[PDB]
Amino acid sequence: DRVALRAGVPPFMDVWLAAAERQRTHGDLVNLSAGQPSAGAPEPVRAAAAAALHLNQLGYSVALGIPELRDAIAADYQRRHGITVEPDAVVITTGSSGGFLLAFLACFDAGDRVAMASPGYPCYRNILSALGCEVVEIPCGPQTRFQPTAQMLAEIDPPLRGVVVASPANPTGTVIPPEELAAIASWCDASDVRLISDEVYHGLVYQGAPQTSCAWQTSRNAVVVNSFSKYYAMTGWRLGWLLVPTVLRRAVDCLTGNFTICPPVLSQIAAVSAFTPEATAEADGNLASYAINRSLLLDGLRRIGIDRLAPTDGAFYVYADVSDFTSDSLAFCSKLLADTGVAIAPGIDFDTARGGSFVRISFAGPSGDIEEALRRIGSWLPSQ
Amino acid sequence: DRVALRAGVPPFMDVWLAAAERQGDLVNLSAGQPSAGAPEPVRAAAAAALHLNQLGYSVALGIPELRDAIAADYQRRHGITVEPDAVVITTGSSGGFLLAFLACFDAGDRVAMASPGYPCYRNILSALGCEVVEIPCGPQTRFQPTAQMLAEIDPLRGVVVASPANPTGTVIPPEELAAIASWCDASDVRLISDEVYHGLVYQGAPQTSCAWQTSRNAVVVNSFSKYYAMTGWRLGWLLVPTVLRRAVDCLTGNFTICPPVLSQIAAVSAFTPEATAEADGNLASYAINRSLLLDGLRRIDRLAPTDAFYVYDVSDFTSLAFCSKLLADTGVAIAPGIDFDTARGGFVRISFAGPSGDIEEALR
Amino acid sequence: HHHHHHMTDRVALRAGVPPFYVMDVWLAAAERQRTHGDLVNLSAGQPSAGAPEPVRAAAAAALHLNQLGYSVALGIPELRDAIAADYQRRHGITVEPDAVVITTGSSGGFLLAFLACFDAGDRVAMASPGYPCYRNILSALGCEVVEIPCGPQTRFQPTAQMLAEIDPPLRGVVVASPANPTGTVIPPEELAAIASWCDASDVRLISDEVYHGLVYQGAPQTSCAWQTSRNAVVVNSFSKYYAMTGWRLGWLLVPTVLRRAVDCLTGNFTICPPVLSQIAAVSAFTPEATAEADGNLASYAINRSLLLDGLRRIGIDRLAPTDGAFYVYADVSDFTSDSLAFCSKLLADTGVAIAPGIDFDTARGGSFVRISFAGPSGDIEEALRRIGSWLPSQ
Amino acid sequence: TDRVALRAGVPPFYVMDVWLAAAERQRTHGDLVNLSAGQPSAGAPEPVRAAAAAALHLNQLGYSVALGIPELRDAIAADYQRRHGITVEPDAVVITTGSSGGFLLAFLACFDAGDRVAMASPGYPCYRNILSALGCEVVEIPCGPQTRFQPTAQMLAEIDPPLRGVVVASPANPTGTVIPPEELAAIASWCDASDVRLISDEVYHGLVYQGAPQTSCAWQTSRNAVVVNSFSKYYAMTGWRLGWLLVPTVLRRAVDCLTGNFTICPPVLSQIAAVSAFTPEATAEADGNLASYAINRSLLLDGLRRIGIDRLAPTDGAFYVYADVSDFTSDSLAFCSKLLADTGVAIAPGIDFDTARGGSFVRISFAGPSGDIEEALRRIGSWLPSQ
Ligand SMILES: *Cc1c(COP(=O)(O)O)cnc(C)c1O
Ligand SMILES: *Cc1c(COP(=O)(O)O)cnc(C)c1O
Ligand SMILES: *Cc1c(COP(=O)(O)O)cnc(C)c1O
Ligand SMILES: *Cc1c(COP(=O)(O)O)cnc(C)c1O
Ligand SMILES: N[C@@H](CCC(=O)O)C(=O)O
Ligand SMILES: O=C(O)CCC(=O)C(=O)O
């Protein structure tokens, strides 16, 4: 019968299915296509959940999230980054994905023009499209560090209602430099445009990269989106938060109660223990493993002949220009899996226009995977 | 400073805040949730999974094991054959409604629902740009709509029905639901069947049925929140018609990525004999509570048929003011009908999912 | 080709001790459920409840946060501190943390206490009826066990005077208050007298205080041996009051002179107590855990009242004072010459399972029966219905 | 006179005493490298932990049957078949509160007070101390490089007056040496012929290194022997206090009666959890620990030669190197105390394991991280030449 037109959005995951089949049929899978850590939640988080299963009913919490977790997040902004955030600014969400749903519904009406970098995270486009917004792609390249600029925003016509930035970004790993983000933030205020700052990969940054910064260092008019999924490796726990501007707090409160009732309560109780010294050590321990992995991957890539890369500043991705080896990146990735069993993500998923020249490689697994993958690509690539 | 117009929806919870402030001598009969937590096999499975599983993202539609278990439950308990592919795991029924409304309806579509009813259907649909058509229902009919009642509306794309319903507790009788289901097919209207309170039914009063007994064109919404008391675990499921499966798959991956994975792994153990015994044990406690409440109320006797864990009817004394005063005076907390019905709710909703002591002490 | 004599296969003589027969009755009960399914069990020597939720939560967290390697032999400081503070907060006696030694149950505590205090051949006295395992441990460890027969006259508990009359002299005395199987508590004055006598007579006192916390209204008050004399060894457990029976955790209050001996023995014999049990048991001293423990006692009190009142009605009115624990020790002599036969028949006929007194008293136990009221009230009520119909036709 | 029993006056388990000394160094100096531990640095495998976590929700955790839960008994019996090809009946298996609890049962069931029980020196100190406290006569058999630090049948044959019992450990604390299959069989056979009870400590089974003699169960030769084993070392369930005995048919009634009176039952949460030790995942994690030990062993042995300590007991299994330090010191106790005070490296003195000859010897543990081994080697290398 009837299917809604707005429901007809592109899919997000499909590559992950393809990889899974290789293990079942061949068993030689090296996976560098994942958009998640290989590590799970830190042990203090797991311990808190284990205790809560005995001590807590796990009924509905208050819509905005438990006070303890809100207090802990607010205190983390001070203790680690020297910005004063009131607990009432923090709203707990069902992942950053849940946070984006709230942010887009509270900030934008149907037909509003919202801008974002390409390449970028595909789901922003797809959520905004389904919610009836007009998505304005800003093509970004090596010239501007794969990130938008204030000037680039200024040139856009007709005017925008919203801008979404991500630092560090999926799939590039590049961070917007503090000055540029501040400029972008300042521009938005002046232009009466709402800024959505994806800060999901904060905490996962590499040495010699530009420093990361919160949008609330410049402007509190911006909506900050963050998660427990990446830095704290609580990916399947579906927990994140928003820093909500005062004017939008009533709207966010009403929407969250109706749409979600509350975030996962076991995840909430457990996540308070993410802000312990032990959990932070385990999180930073994962980053240390990533840094080693990054070095091996970058150095390996040059040797095999892939030297044009987006600046790997953070996250756990290398965004690689593979154009010399192929006209179509989708075909390239499919073949490599079929031939070697090494699984990588095609750039088409992140960029419809220019992605066919590009590939995304994840280094959040074991070093063995990176090392073995490099051996296999090195033997395979010259005969392509 | 710009706030979206669509964001300006009514809130859901407000009574729960009022009760919290009192903690007088609080007796709470205003809750929309069980007082019990998850069954012990569910908790045990989660405890084990914290050691054995990474708890990364699952596949968007949910883990095969949980999908298989839900499909098998429809057969084993209710004699309807459901394919595992029909089942889509969601972040609660609230997450399920988001998917159902986005997949089935475009902005501007007319979707009908009973009043009184669950406030969040109106508020989700309004925010998603749909046109909400209230169907006022009272004692004269089921407090559930009928095909004829739907037929008389001019000019619908969708109908949402709930059996048993919040706040009445009434079930749509199997014949009437089938009729409603059949009408929808004939009229080319999409049916959203809220079946969240299935498994919580009382001796006699009507009987529950799945929409898929009559028509597979309807979307079935269900949850682990009420029968399995996994309220804070945020886990539910949809039975999705074949035509809508691609749309639901694409939306869920973009909007949620996947449902809570620890909740998914744990919920497989909900379909054990031990978990079912604990769930039915809760129902036995509710039945006792129901009897005490109904009999006590008469000693106010005009109520919606208590076929969930709610009693929905008083007018002689006043409803928003009534409830506020009773809490301030006695400390007994009850929900005002205004939250469920804007037109006629100024009615009361009393919850009996707590301990029997609370029920007994409550009357004054 | 040729047959030949085989050398006698050697089993130690000291190993030839009686079994803990309370386990044997538990086996008999189990068969009734498998074959008939009508079992009402009043024969158990343990709570029907498990560990309190804060204890379980602490263990669940420790499985994630702690390696669970060997602890220090005497037990973790936190648990030792908590036990010492409990003596003050609840009973107003000052106990130094160093006095507390954590053990693998009270059973492990008795092994340490008996090895540290007594040599082989030493005369150690105990009440009969009593807990069978004291006799069996002491016998196996080469001590001479002196039974003191106790009855209604002396509240089924020894007295200082009774001890004074014993010849030849004793090296040790074991008292239990509340006791298995009677449930009687030694009154504070009498225990003090017993404690004082021991000091004067240079006799070591072993005070079993395992059932402390499980006492009923109008019973004599319970008291620690260390209120009178610190020369006595106090034995206690998490098994009964805190229902941590399978966790195998308890403690000793060790006199200063015996601390070196206990330390050396425990490290060699056990290395350390169960570490997960240790970490978890710190949370037993929370308000929530104490409420759950006292909640169990409230359920027992109700059960006690139903059982006592029911027993009089059916004609069993001569009982040991049910002061604590969760046992009624009943004189069934009017109904039977042999208690072992009585219990076997009742199980075969009604399915109600009770413990024969022979297990606790070899000499006089055949007149006696032990009934446990730590299960659900339904069990008590149904058991009373079944005995009432069965007994008059015996 | 305030009375303490004479039998109570035994030596302490001095391994614990060294552990106390090490602890102080971390609190005061913070430079502790610990190679003195008698336990794995790893905890229980994740399937074991998961089973315990689930049991806390699903099980009352009351007393089990005295001999241990059927499931765990069945799993242990099946492990002897599946891994080592010996058929063991579930009734032969008795679950105990560690091997320490197992030794208490074994010694009480097999020996009366005054019975002569023999053991290798150096060896695990607790056998002597348990047997002494239980009133037995302990017969030390001094063992050295000549006989691989392990007793022989011939060595046993020479002992006068006759013995009632023999305790052997393979692999042993503190040497790490395994008794070769032939020699253990010979020892087992001798015992039967001589009407002497054999107690076979098999606690470190599963922790063996490449090119070492193979390990074997005493029940491959004789079922008259008592086998003692544990979850403490191979399965790293050290604080769970769980082990088992293979009990000869004649001793089963005695062991049953003693265990019920002395312990009631083993730790029930540990029992339920340990069933999951026999999963493929748990075995992989256990073997993973061994792989880490093997690396550590190689670094330690090679490092020791370079610094000048080259006379060692054959490191066949366990996680110990038993090192002859006589060239560097007359007293090993002083040596270890000084090294801790000077470098912060903590090692165990041989006196704890051998009262007569241990002052020439030292025990080094390699169950920690490789960093510890590597750093320890750097520190000893700088310190030793000026001694
Ligand atoms: C992985 C990822 C997400 C997912 O966030 P959740 O908190 O798991 O919903 C969102 N945005 C970006 C840019 C990501 O890379
Ligand atoms: C609880 C409830 C739902 C679903 O809520 P979830 O907790 O998200 O499953 C739907 N309708 C009514 C009337 C309810 O009470
Ligand atoms: C149960 C019991 C004990 C000890 O139990 P543990 O678990 O070993 O602490 C001690 N004495 C009596 C009289 C008992 O009934
Ligand atoms: C460490 C060790 C044990 C351990 O005893 P458990 O009770 O298993 O911890 C037993 N025997 C020997 C020889 C050891 O070295
Ligand atoms: N009355 C007991 C307290 C019971 C307990 O906490 O174990 C005592 O004297 O120690
Ligand atoms: O958890 C973290 O470290 C991220 C906090 C954050 O938002 C920031 O660094 O700005």
Ligand SMILES: O=C(O)CCC(=O)C(=O)O
């Ligand atoms: O080495 C063998 O054959 C037996 C191993 C063993 O004792 C065990 O199963 O732990």
